[PDB]
Subunit: 387 residues, 4 copies
Amino acid sequence: AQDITTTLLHPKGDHVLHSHAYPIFQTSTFCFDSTQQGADLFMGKGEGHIYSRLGNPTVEQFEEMVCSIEGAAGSAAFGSGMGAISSSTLAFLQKGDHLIAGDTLYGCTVSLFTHWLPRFGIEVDLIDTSDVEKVKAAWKPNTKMVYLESPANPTCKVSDIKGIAVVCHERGARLVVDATFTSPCFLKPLELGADIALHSVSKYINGHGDVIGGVSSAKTAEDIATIKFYRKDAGSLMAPMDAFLCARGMKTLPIRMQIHMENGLKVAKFLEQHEKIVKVNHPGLESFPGHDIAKKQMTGYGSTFLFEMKSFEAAKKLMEHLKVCTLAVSLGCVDTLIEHPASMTHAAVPENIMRKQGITPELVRISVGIENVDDIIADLKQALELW
Amino acid sequence: AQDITTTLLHPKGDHVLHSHAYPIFQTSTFCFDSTQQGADLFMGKGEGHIYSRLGNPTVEQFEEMVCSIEGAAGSAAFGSGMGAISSSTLAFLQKGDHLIAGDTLYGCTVSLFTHWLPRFGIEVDLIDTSDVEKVKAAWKPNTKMVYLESPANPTCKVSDIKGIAVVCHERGARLVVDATFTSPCFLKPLELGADIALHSVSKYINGHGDVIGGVSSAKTAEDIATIKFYRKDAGSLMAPMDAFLCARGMKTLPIRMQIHMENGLKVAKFLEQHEKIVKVNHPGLESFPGHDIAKKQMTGYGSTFLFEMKSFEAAKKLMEHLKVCTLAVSLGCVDTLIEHPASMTHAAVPENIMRKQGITPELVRISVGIENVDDIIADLKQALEL
Amino acid sequence: DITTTLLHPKGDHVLHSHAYPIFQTSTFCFDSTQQGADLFMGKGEGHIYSRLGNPTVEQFEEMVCSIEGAAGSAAFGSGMGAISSSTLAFLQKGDHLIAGDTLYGCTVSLFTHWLPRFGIEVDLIDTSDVEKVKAAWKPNTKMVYLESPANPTCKVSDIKGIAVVCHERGARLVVDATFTSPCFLKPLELGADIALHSVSKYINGHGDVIGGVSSAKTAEDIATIKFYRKDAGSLMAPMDAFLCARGMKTLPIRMQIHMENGLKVAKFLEQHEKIVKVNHPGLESFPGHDIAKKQMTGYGSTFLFEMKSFEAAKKLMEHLKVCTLAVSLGCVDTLIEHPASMTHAAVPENIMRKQGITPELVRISVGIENVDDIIADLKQALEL
Amino acid sequence: AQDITTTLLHPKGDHVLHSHAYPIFQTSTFCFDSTQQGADLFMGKGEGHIYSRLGNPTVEQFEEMVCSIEGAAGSAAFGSGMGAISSSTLAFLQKGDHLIAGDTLYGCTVSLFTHWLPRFGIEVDLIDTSDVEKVKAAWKPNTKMVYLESPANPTCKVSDIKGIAVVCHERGARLVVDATFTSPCFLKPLELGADIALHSVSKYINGHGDVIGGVSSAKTAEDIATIKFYRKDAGSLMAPMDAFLCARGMKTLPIRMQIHMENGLKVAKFLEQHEKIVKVNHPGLESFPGHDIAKKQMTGYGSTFLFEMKSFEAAKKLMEHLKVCTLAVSLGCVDTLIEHPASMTHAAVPENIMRKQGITPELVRISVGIENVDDIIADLKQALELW
Ligand SMILES: CSCC/C(=N\Cc1c(COP(=O)(O)O)cnc(C)c1O)C(=O)O
Ligand SMILES: CSCC/C(=N\Cc1c(COP(=O)(O)O)cnc(C)c1O)C(=O)O
Ligand SMILES: CSCC/C(=N\Cc1c(COP(=O)(O)O)cnc(C)c1O)C(=O)O
Ligand SMILES: C/C=C(/N=C/c1c(COP(=O)(O)O)cnc(C)c1O)C(=O)O
């Protein structure tokens, strides 16, 4: 069986005009040969293109690469991870439906689920999905979907994706998994029983900190068709240039992830043994609750994780005196980023949910890049040992 | 009174690193000076950027350009006209609300209002908005929005935006106008009393057929903040490169529109007097119902319009023997496009709505470009002779 | 008209795409050894490697070629790349070049510093007078190189008359028509062998690309130019060619506006008490107007005018609110510069005097803004 | 000392408008504050920009990255490797000067030195530079430059860069080295005594097969200023978009080269032991002449090399029956390329020079990518073992 490195470098499809790199189809529309040919494409008959919102060759090339690593029936690219998330939930959920979602989610996902979904008559509970019994207890006759992020942003809380998938499968609910934090090299939710696997491509998949985009992949042709139908009307599109950039970043995804995984673990171990650090939430550490599940259900770890300092002042002093790490939000970039969730990525999260998420002023999140790991550790060490 | 040509070519804002052209900020994230500075930005305090989904300087420069021409409090750019439409309606409407929309709308707008909105518990009635009395009769206690396209895609049906805005003002509803077909050079819905004006930037605004994008502009600061809050979560973003291309295309928008307008009128009059053509639906023709309203409420016309052949066979002959015009959906490009609405742009609209729209297999939609008109007419004359 | 031709270029669509795709690629795949071998021998149809040929760049080349009436066109990474490729592809040690005495600063640098290092004799002379061209002629003269109207003074050379001299005497005539665009000046139509442009100016028109183009009357000459380019390596990037082709779609319409704005502005300046003299080729007062009127079908909107002192020029250039102080020209928005300390600052003193470039001169490149707004900007800056 | 991976990911310079990724300055011109500020910039006084041909911020960012890895006084980026080679030779050589260049060079370099330089009154000899004594024997009173490619394209012939540099330094000649085949990760000619080190950035540096570009770096400020002065008039520029892409590709250069090097050596060893293969020219093999010089003077190897089949027909059969390798010219891409030098990259090389270079119809050149090496080897093996 051919390695994923090779698969990503050799995607299926004809070359265009013998071009080795796939061209950028910076076009809005496409030409018809005849009234019939154009009519037929609008009915889904024949091969070809109509209009970039319905399908653009460069974006489709990126979709096929993701589809190939997810093992999906199809993938849909979007203008952002939030586009993928809206389109993977609201394409299916309608008034009177019930959604169970993790209680520790990316801030704007909490915003979408707690502000917008209830306005559309959709019932939403945020539940601790690290415990399958709590998921079952929150289940209702109208539950149509469970939505999980695991490991969760930013605390890395692990959910039992396989265990929850069994209950979804028995009860007729879709299981949707945001695998952004781990990448499809290491977490393949469709292999664990999910119906839909999605990512912010803005993070690891693209990897170069220069594109916002999203992708969603479905286990069935019907589900990916419905998602694309929603996309056509909701309009979160990946631009041709951004698709060219995402496909290009993904060409190095397997080797970047290997380096991220190993750097991340080494940085977490360094932090865990350091006297200034109270606790390290990296799901690859034996000390981490849920390490046993992550180890079984994933084939590696991402390199974004959280650690606890002794105070807010210690956290600030660390974050502001680094020379290699960059103070900024986002994650999954080739270079190391660091931020303060309580006052940044999660500052818009309701106090109620903040308290249950376990997010405090002492926490710092680091997204470890592919720099030489000793250089990253020496940067953290000099800031930690400051006068 | 500085002219709009000059305004578009001289947008407000600082140069970046003294660059003459505005740089393409192909970035996802921005760096913070300190914890406090990043925290302040997240609370909307101070000046700066955080992350391109929240705000990208290249995208914002294009937003400022549109905002100036619309006379708006602010503008939001999107990944498509459908992103703008979605974000300008679903940012406000919620379960139990009622929407009144024009009966003649772009096909996917029909799909949005007719398939997705009701799944979200929003009641929707499509009605003939060319008669303000029919809008009044359709009104309900829970009516929160009227949504109009004028002239409508593809029949060019005209609504009294001004009269309808009075009714919305009186009865506590937002008026949203899709002004894609006319461009903001010739139609400024916020000057007519609308609350929101939006475009498929994919059409005239960009004008070069190489970008898909949307823009929406609101009369009030609170409404544009809501639109952008919805955009934050829904995620239809204009890419930095596309914003660079849309701003660049918009630099020639006023001259392109002058030519489109003059060209489309000349073509329509040629077709109207030709023996093979049953009727021509251009809002700038004296024969067109709604001409009197379009002339008073607009300062010009787009060049996309519809005409009727004597049979489907005839329309097919004409569409397939043109050498200059290109058979393709979309409109408002520098070159001439031609389309068959029944089986293309409006193929998916339900039979009953299609009947109400007056769309038949005999209709052909042309989007007249900025070619020498004599070439477009000769191309048409050529084909009609076969 | 020209607009229809530029909007409907010849060629096939790629994958039915309406906009021509951006071939952001270095290399192309071969179907077999034989097919790749054949392409390297110039047999069959297809591509090998973007330096030899890129489809997006070739589409832009074909657009310029059609408008110039050429046998072919070559795109480059800058106007300087087109210039050095249209001259050094032909001239060799022992050859002599006659060049206009007033040229863009970097062309002066090329001809004055580099060409003589390569054993090429160069005389800069006043090409507004054909007898001076004849008098400078030598048995080893192989090329005349003209800019008309010249940058920055707008000095006009008789292209047609010089072409007759060149044809009779076995020399190539190369014309840089940057200042006028191919809508208005078509040197190959006047007898020239090669016509070239800084695409960075009018042709692109949007101030966001640097590029060059050269067009040759003969198939053999464009082959030589591309052969030189293959080894010298000044290429137009596929993204820049996409942008250039895109800007060119509005070229004829922009040029009509530039021309009309520029004339109205020159006329305003010419009757202003603060202005000594306006060098615009379309003015009746300008020496060489009669040639320019006969050999061109319009005018660009870049031209020079004379203030009463350096201090006055500085005051004018530093109080404009619409016009931007920057080098370059032919952009949609109005640009203004000081040739003596900017574009022409490195020109040797003696060539400078021969050019007539003094610290009292300001060069303006009138954009497509409403002319009344640009006149009001100049007006307040001249009077307050 | 900080690792090169870290340096490339953290290049010196201020961020622009706090942007994490460096913006694309798609501009021709820049604005002046005043006539004095503009006048000064033209005199080289003060900080700022004028016009992209003279200096573009995005291009300068990429130049700084190369300069940092070369250990140079400065770097200049170009529209192509050939722009870099032209500008690194013709910026210095004039009529009456003499150039000694290697006899095995990239085809278009042979075209430049053999067709264009003599037209400009520059004397050129192509010499076997793998023998320092032959270089000395070719020396004349007017010799001003030696130009080397090592390992040479496509035979991998190795020159003694250090030994030749001694002779250049004693006699007042510049040494110019095209290090395209090896990359600046493994070959740093300025540390071996070269005055100028240059690359086709089109190959490894960019790495992604989607840009043509060049770069040249000089040991002295004076020489890089002269190179840029030439560039200003000859006009081979790197476009702002291309510079953004080259900088982006270069963020993964160290990890890509590590994999290229390891894959290329394993493929060479596989080929060297295979019955169908007559000889393998990879400078990292102990069997290769000049292996001892390459191993002392480089810190690794590129993964483009040539091998000899038993016949032209055998080469064609191999080249036309691969599923992973792509038949195409160029090299140094993430995916594996293969070509036939005799009829492709070197088909324009004059017969006498071909014979001097040792290029025959039996030779195949492979540029090994970063695919899983076992997939690459299995692809070659199945083609070699065809019916
Ligand atoms: C507060 S601003 C920083 C962005 C960010 N996270 C993003 C993200 C998204 C959304 O993806 P989009 O940004 O729309 O491509 C979806 N799902 C997950 C697990 C995510 O981590 C962060 O820094 O924690
Ligand atoms: C059937 S496919 C051709 C697209 C098309 N029209 C689009 C359009 C949109 C949507 O804008 P987006 O396409 O999302 O940028 C919004 N509003 C109006 C009046 C529109 O006409 C057409 O060819 O009639
Ligand atoms: C001092 S820097 C400003 C650039 C400039 N002129 C350029 C130019 C070129 C060169 O074109 P490239 O810049 O290489 O695309 C060629 N030919 C002509 C008639 C030109 O005017 C100027 O502002 O006068
Ligand atoms: C198709 C190109 C091949 N080579 C190129 C090359 C260049 C020239 O570099 P641009 O191509 O001008 O960037 C310079 N120096 C070296 C050692 C090279 O290999 C090839 O062999 O396959």
